[PDB]
A paper describes a structure:
To enter epithelial cells, the obligate intracellular pathogen [name] pneumoniae secretes early effector proteins, which bind to and modulate the host-cell’s plasma membrane and recruit several pivotal endocytic host proteins. The early secreted Cpn effector protein [name] binds to the inner leaflet of the PM below the invading EB and directly recruits G-actin and the essential endocytic proteins SNX9 and N-WASP12. During a Cpn infection, the C-terminus of the membrane-bound [name] interacts with the BR-GBD domain of N-WASP, thus triggering N-WASP activation and Arp2/3-mediated actin polymerisation via an unknown mechanism. We demonstrate that [name], a protein of 382 aa, can interact simultaneously with the PM, SNX9 and N-WASP, thereby combining membrane association and deformation with modulation of the actin polymerisation machinery.
To understand the activation of N-WASP by [name], we structurally analysed the complex formed by recombinant [name]ΔAPH and the BR-GBD domain of N-WASP. Despite the moderate resolution of the crystals containing the [name]ΔAPH – BR-GBD complex, the interaction surface between the two proteins is well resolved. Comparison of the structures of [name]ΔAPH alone and in complex with BR-GBD revealed virtually identical conformations of the [name] core regions, as indicated by a low RMSD of 0.7 Å. Additionally, five residues of the N-WASP CRIB domain engage with residues in the [name] binding groove, mainly formed by helix α4, the adjacent loop and helix α9. The N-WASP C-sub domain is located underneath the helical arrangement of [name]ΔAPH, flanked by its extended helix α1. Owing to the flexibility of the N-terminal domains of [name]ΔAPH and BR-GBD, these regions are not resolved in the crystal structure of the complex. Our structural and biochemical data further reveal that [name] provides the negatively charged patch and the binding groove required for selective binding of the positively charged C-terminal part of the BR and the CRIB domains of N-WASP, respectively, thus mimicking Cdc42GTP-mediated N-WASP activation.
Author numbering:
A (entry chain A): 67 to 159
B (entry chain D): 70 to 177, 180 to 272, 277 to 318
Amino acid sequence: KKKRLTKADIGTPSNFQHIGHVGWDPNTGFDLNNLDPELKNLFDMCGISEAQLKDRETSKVIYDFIEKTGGVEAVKNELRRQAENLYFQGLEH
Amino acid sequence: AMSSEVAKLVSELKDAVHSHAESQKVLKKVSQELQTKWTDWENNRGPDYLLHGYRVIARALQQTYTEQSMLIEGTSSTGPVPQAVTVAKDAVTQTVRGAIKNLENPKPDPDGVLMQVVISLGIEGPTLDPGESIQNFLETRVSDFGGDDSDIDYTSDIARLGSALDRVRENHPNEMPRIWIALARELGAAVHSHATSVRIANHTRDVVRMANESSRLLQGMKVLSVGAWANTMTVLIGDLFEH
């Protein structure tokens, strides 16, 4: 039988709700409920305001830096290394 | 906008309305490109379209794999594997082996609606709002792919998957990426096998660099509108696994 979505429907909006790439929307900025935790942690260490994350002009520049330096993956790996480093450095001989 | 304080209201709303309808113009151009290309490639290049469609999907399954790989808690089994996730992982294998079966070893007549749905689940599912019902997603998709008229009954397979995946999604949310990766690795093997068996029936091999084109246009759509991408993904899927 007929598939409701045919080639003429390409690009039409989904009737479902979607997270968004790297939790970022290019008009509304970062969705703060579905932001990544480790990315948030990075942003807090940088003093970045919730209003700067939700601003279009500034969130783009954050988004773009994050893509520059190796995507969210590199950031995650970095906070993680830092945590296992902080694990061994809490040890007292 | 005379006052200092109404001029900002005017400016902000001005901007909001414009850059919205501006981003709609963009999306529309990318859509119309992707539309004329796929339409032509279907109507001309016949089974090379099909062949590239698998690879565009195949590429999108691998992408959710590595994306969701980097959300998993510990690769180590830190306590007992909860019940809900064992049941979810098993449902992935069963619904996928059965979507494989409706298509390859049927009973008199091959049908691919089940393949199509779980493929959409595998690519599009990890992108859904955590609030979205996986049961509902799967139900909506058997209608969108035909299903209601088709003489196979899917209500058994959907409730297997929806039930299992939704139990994890609400009760053990941090374990969901574990299930998404499983779904993608099984789907990724399943697709690549369908691609290699459809290759056997006389074909231009390296002109399925279409794949790099579509996955370029689709990647542009995705950053503009994840939802629009998910819709045009399910359009591609609807042209696959049929006959």
